[PDB]
Design a protein around this ligand. Structure first.
Ligand SMILES: COc1ccc(N/C=C2\C(=O)CCc3c2oc2cc(Cl)c(O)c(Cl)c32)cc1
Length: 329
C-alpha cells in the first residue's frame, strides 16, 4: 500500500538529461572573491539560515546586498549557490554577483545586486489592479524560468519578492530552500512559510513538484486582490489546513487525499469538520472590489486547487486572460 506516486506534468525529466554537474550540487566547487571588496553598511534582517546586510562595493562605490549564510548545513549552502548560478541571467531572478568567505562567520557570504525594495506591507496597500497583474506576470516569468531549469523555489511569499516600485523592477529572492526537481524523489515537507504551504505539505505528501510554487503564488494573489494578508491565516500547520478547508471545502480535500491514497493526521479528526466550498464573491467587499474581476477570480481558482497536478503551470498562467490587459516587454 502507501501513497500513490506523483510526477510534475511539465519539465518532468529536465535534470536527468543534463550533465550530472548541473544538479549534483554536493560536488560543486565555489569560486571565491575578495571579502574586503565589500563594506557592510547596515543589517537588513536575520533569519534561521542567514543574516542580510546592505553593503557597498568599495572598489566602485556600488550598492550591493550581502547574505552571510549561517553554518547550519553545508549541503544546503552548496545547493543555494549552485541554483543561483544555474539561474543567473533568467528573467527576474536575483543576480548573484560574487561569493566571498566572511571573516567573522567563516561561512560563504553571497553578494547580490541591490534592489530598492519597499516593504510589502506598505507596498501591497498601494498596488492598483493593473499593478497586481503586472507584478504577478513578472513573478510568473521567474517561476517558469526556474521550473524550466529543473528547480522549484519552495519559499514563494511577499517577503521573497523584492520590488522597486519607482522603477517597476522585481526580483525573486531567497533561494535557500530551492531544490532540483527529480521525478519520483520524495522531498522535505518543512518548506515555505506556513501561510503559503501547499496542501501537499500540510497533508505530508512528499513527492511534490514545481506546482507547490503555484499554490504559494495563488496565496499571494488572494491576499492582494482581496487585501487580506495573509489570506489563509493559520495559527499552526494543522490550523493552516483547516483555514484552507473553510474556503475550498472539505469534500475536495478528501477527494485529493483519496486520489493519492494519503491518510490525514488523526489530529484533524476533531478540528477539520465539514465545510462547503465557498464562492470567491464572499471575500469581495467595498474595499477590494476595484481589485477583483471575473478574470482574477478564474485565475485564482485555477491556482488554489488541492490537487497539485490540477493547478496551472507557470507557463499556462501567463496565457490567462487576467494578463490580457498587461503590456508585455
Ligand atoms: C529595509 O530596506 C531594504 C532595502 C533593500 C533590501 N534589499 C534586500 C535584498 C536585495 O536588495 C537584494 C536581494 C536580497 C535582498 O534581501 C535578500 C534576502 C535574502 Cl534571504 C536573499 O536571498 C536575497 Cl537574494 C535578498 C532590503 C531592505
Amino acid at each position: 500500500s502507501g501513497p500513490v506516486p506523483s510526477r510534475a506534468r511539465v519539465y518532468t525529466d529536465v535534470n536527468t538529461h543534463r550533465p550530472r554537474e548541473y544538479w549534483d550540487y554536493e560536488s560543486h566547487v565555489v569560486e571565491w572573491g575578495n571579502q574586503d571588496d565589500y563594506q557592510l553598511v547596515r543589517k537588513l534582517g536575520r533569519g534561521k539560515y542567514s543574516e542580510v546586510f546592505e553593503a557597498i562595493n568599495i572598489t566602485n562605490n556600488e550598492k550591493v546586498v550581502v547574505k552571510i549564510l549561517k553554518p547550519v548545513k553545508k549541503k544546503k549552502i552548496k545547493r543555494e549557490i549552485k541554483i543561483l548560478e544555474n539561474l543567473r541571467g533568467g528573467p527576474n531572478i536575483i543576480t548573484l554577483a560574487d561569493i566571498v568567505k566572511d571573516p567573522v562567520s567563516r561561512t560563504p557570504a553571497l553578494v547580490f545586486e541591490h534592489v530598492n525594495n519597499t516593504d510589502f506591507k506598505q507596498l501591497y496597500q498601494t498596488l492598483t489592479d493593473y499593478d497586481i497583474r503586472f507584478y504577478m506576470y513578472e513573478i510568473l516569468k521567474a517561476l517558469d524560468y526556474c521550473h524550466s531549469m529543473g528547480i522549484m523555489h519552495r519559499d514563494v511569499k511577499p517577503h521573497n519578492v523584492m520590488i522597486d516600485h519607482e522603477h517597476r523592477k522585481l526580483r525573486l529572492i531567497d533561494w535557500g530552500l530551492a531544490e532540483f526537481y527529480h521525478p519520483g524523489q520524495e522531498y522535505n515537507v518543512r518548506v515555505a512559510s506556513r501561510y503559503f504551504k501547499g496542501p501537499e505539505l500540510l497533508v505530508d505528501y512528499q513527492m511534490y513538484d514545481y506546482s507547490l510554487d503555484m499554490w504559494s503564488l495563488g496565496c499571494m494573489l488572494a491576499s492582494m486582490i482581496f487585501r487580506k494578508e495573509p489570506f489563509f491565516h493559520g495559527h499552526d500547520n494543522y490550523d493552516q489546513l483547516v483555514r484552507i478547508a473553510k474556503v475550498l471545502g472539505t469534500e475536495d480535500l478528501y477527494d485529493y487525499i483519496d486520489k493519492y491514497n494519503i491518510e490525514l493526521d488523526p489530529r484533524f479528526n476533531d478540528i477539520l469538520g465539514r465545510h462547503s466550498r465557498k464562492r470567491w464573491e464572499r471575500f469581495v467587499h467595498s474595499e477590494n472590489q476595484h481589485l477583483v474581476s471575473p478574470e482574477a477570480l478564474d485565475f485564482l481558482d485555477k491556482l488554489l486547487r488541492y490537487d497539485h497536478q490540477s493547478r496551472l503551470t507557470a507557463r499556462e498562467a501567463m496565457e490567462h486572460p487576467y494578463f490580457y490587459t498587461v503590456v508585455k516587454d
